[PDB]
C-alpha cells in the first residue's frame, strides 16, 4: 500500500516507513540504497515503476 506508514519487509530488508513514488527513470537497477546501506530507492521492472 502506498504513501502510508506501515511495517514492511522487502527482499530481506524491512522496517517501518512510508513508501513513495518518484519518476526518475534509470536503465540500471531494480533497487538502491544509501551509502550508509539504507535501502532508499528501488525500481519496478514489470511496470517500469
Amino acid at each position: 500500500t502506498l504513501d502510508v506508514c506501515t511495517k514492511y519487509t522487502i527482499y530481506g530488508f524491512k522496517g517501518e516507513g512510508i513508501i513513495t513514488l518518484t519518476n526518475s527513470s534509470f536503465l540500471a537497477g531494480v533497487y538502491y540504497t544509501s551509502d550508509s546501506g539504507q535501502l532508499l530507492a528501488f525500481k519496478n521492472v514489470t511496470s517500469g515503476a
Binding site: 534509470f26 536503465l27 540500471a28
Partner: protein, 49 residues
Amino acid sequence: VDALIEVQGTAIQRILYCDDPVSQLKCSQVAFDLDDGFYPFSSRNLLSH
C-alpha cells in the same frame, strides 16, 4: 581487466584501461588527471615469475 569506472545516473562513460605501468599509476591515484609534482613509486618488479 582493471580500469576506472564512471556512473552517470545509470550511464557509464570515460573508461581507461589500467594495462600500463604509468596508467596503473594514474589508476593508483584514481584521478582522470593529476598535477605535476613529487610522488613516491615502487620499483618495477614484474620481470619474471
